Structure formats: C-alpha cells, structure tokens
Write a protein that binds this DNA or RNA. Structure first.
Length: 65
RNA sequence: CCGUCGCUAGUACCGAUUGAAUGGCUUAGUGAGGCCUCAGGAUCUGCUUAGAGAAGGGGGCAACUCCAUCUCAGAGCGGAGA
C-alpha cells in the first residue's frame, strides 16, 4: 500500500515543471486565502503579530507514504 | 560484436522563419545648436534747435521788453541696443 514512484529525480523535476506550469498567483502578491480548517483547532489560533504564523505550500502526493 | 527496435531524459547543431534590441556601412531626405554675416529696432541716452509754463535780475516803467535756471512736449543729427 505504498506509493511506488519509479525514478525520483526525473519525476521530481517533472512535477516541479508541472508546479511552475500551475503557479496561479506568483511571489510578490497579497492573498486572502481560505484554508480548510476545523473548528476545534481554533483554540490554538494565536495573536499573529505575537506568535509567528507561517503558511507553506505542498506538492503532489507528498502526503502519501 | 555491440550492430537493430521503439521509449527515458541530457549534449552539440540548422536558419527557412517571426518578434524585438544593438552596431557597421551605404542611398536619399530632414536637420537642433552656437559662431560669422544681411537685416530689424522693445527700448534708453547724448548734443543742438524750436514751442509752452514757472523763480530772479536789468530796463518804456502802466501793461511791456531783454538775459540767466528748471519742467512739459516737437524736430533733426548721433551712439548703445533686447
């Protein structure tokens, strides 16, 4: 039940090419982002000028083992 | 003996093109600017010469006449000159 990618380097570079193809809003922009976020994790929403709160984007199937 | 088969990406290429950008020549045309020159004369100014007003002096002495000093405008001859 594992994700079997054949060659890491070439598929990695190709998916980076796909990501650069699919860059919907470029670096240097300001975004009102709506992220899917459950109710119970609102208890850790801190003062954003008081706690650092960074947002990092992911790629295709970096979630699969 | 590593020579075909089709795929996987990496390495040199053509130039037939388009889109700009740079430079070298070359044809023709346009051609800013200062300088010299033909002019032009906003303006100022110098002398004279008149006309008209004021102050003084000398004289028929009654107005009036003569001479010196300014002011306002003309006419010439000049110079400078945007």
């Amino acid at each position: 039940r594992l994700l079997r990618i054949g060659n890491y380097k070439n598929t990695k570079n190709r998916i980076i090419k796909e990501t650069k193809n699919e860059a919907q809003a470029i670096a240097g922009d300001r975004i009102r982002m709506f992220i899917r976020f459950p109710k119970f994790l609102l208890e850790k929403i801190q003062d954003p000028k008081q706690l650092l709160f960074a947002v990092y984007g992911l790629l295709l199937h970096e979630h699969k083992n």
